[PDB]
């Protein structure tokens, strides 16, 4: 070219130059233009050096102890962009798709821009374990699973031949979400006086019906017919009818009695509405339930319970109250694996055995 080397680029990276005004500008290998970035020297070079994370521009790579096997191909950061175009055609609910994007985004700021047959299993483990040392173990499991299905679909499109991610293991969580007893229940309901009125009503309604907080904010006064409570879960899709004759003596809460309270005080189209006579979100209900938790002053071991824990407390109560098969059909749950993993205590209460 006209200017191969100079006494100005002599202290600058391949991209980025310096004008006659002491200013610096970084070139663009897509049009041949540039933008002015920096007035200093050690700043423009320390800025036009991370985009420079990809001089492929000479240099190759090799760690301590390893083999060789390569040839030629294309980028990969782009594959993460084409993978998102495939997931949007798999027909997924509008909530699960977002869960995947968040993970793919973490993969972006985790692994270096690199071809696909370059990212070795060791590189994926360095990033994976990085989240484990931070405590986030449940995250590393989802990030690994997602990054695993991405390469699987990649191999099915003539790009890769192996799945290095399948080589590394996945973290094993322990679920440190403490449960909620019946005694701590009244302790929170008593401190829910400073909070709105719909909170206490939806708090008892969430323990008398044992439904999800999401479907709890979807019930209307038209879903009640002949004394039944037609509820259509959105998560699974199961359909059940809850009788308005239920009752919890362990807390002294009647089903019908609780329902009527939401018809006078609250009032509206939905069973649980706001002070403005409007339906609330599933993130605001469990939100205020937290305030009464912290304001209480009680202490636990691990992670404080939640509004969803009310569903668990509801199941444990109905167990000893009536039967076991009763606290299974009401929760809109089937199978025979979670019915037991939802009755446990997880280091809280001793499993006392009685003469029976």
């Amino acid at each position: 070219m006209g200017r191969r080397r100079s006494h100005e680029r002599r202290d600058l990276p391949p991209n980025l130059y310096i004008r006659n005004n002491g200013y610096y500008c970084y070139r663009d290998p897509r049009t041949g233009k540039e933008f002015g970035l920096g007035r200093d020297r050690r700043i423009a070079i320390t800025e036009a050096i991370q985009a420079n994370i990809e001089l492929f521009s000479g240099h190759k790579h090799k760690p301590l102890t390893a083999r060789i096997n390569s040839d030629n191909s294309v980028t990969l950061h782009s594959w993460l962009d084409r993978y998102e175009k495939i997931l949007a055609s798999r027909g997924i609910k509008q909530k699960t798709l977002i869960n995947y994007m968040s993970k793919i985004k973490a993969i972006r700021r985790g692994l270096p821009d690199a071809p696909l047959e370059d990212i070795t299993t060791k590189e994926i483990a360095a990033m994976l374990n990085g989240y484990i040392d931070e405590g986030k173990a449940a995250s590393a499991k989802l990030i690994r699973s997602t990054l695993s299905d991405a390469f699987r679909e990649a191999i099915a499109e003539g790009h890769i031949t192996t799945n290095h991610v399948a080589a590394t293991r996945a973290a094993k969580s322990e679920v440190r979400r403490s449960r909620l007893t019946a005694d701590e229940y009244l302790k929170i309901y008593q401190a829910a006086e400073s909070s709105p009125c719909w909170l206490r009503l939806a708090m008892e309604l969430a323990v008398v019906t044992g439904q999800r907080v999401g479907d709890l904010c979807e019930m209307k006064w038209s879903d009640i017919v002949d004394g039944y409570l037609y509820v259509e879960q959105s998560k699974t899709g199961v359909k059940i009818a809850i009788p308005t004759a239920l009752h919890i003596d362990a807390l002294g809460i009647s089903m019908k009695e609780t329902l009527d309270k939401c018809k006078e005080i609250l009032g509206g189209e939905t069973i649980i509405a706001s002070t403005r006579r409007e339906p609330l979100s599933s993130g605001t209900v469990s939100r205020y339930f937290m305030r009464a938790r912290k304001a209480s002053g009680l202490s636990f071991e691990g992670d404080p319970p939640t509004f969803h824990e009310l569903r668990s407390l509801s199941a444990r109560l109905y167990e000893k109250q009536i039967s076991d098969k009763f606290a299974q059909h009401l929760l809109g749950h089937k199978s025979d694996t979670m019915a037991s993993q939802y009755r446990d205590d997880r280091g809280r209460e001793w499993d006392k055995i009685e003469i029976k």
């Binding site: 080397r5 002599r10 202290d11 050690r42 070079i45 320390t46 050096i49």
Partner: protein, 54 residues
């Protein structure tokens, strides 16, 4: 994991004089820069040399 200027020069293809090691930092010939912490640079576990020319 961050190392010192002495510990870093010990884990390279060829250990040179401390003077030369300090020179590379000043000339910005290592990704990423050491960043002076008090009165002694702190290399990154992945900070390798690059070398320029004209």
């Amino acid at each position: 994991m961050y190392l010192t200027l002495q510990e870093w020069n010990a884990r390279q293809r060829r250990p040179r004089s401390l003077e030369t090691v300090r020179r590379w930092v000043r000339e910005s010939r290592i990704f990423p820069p050491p960043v002076k912490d008090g009165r002694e640079y702190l290399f990154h576990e992945s900070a390798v040399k690059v070398d320029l020319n004209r």
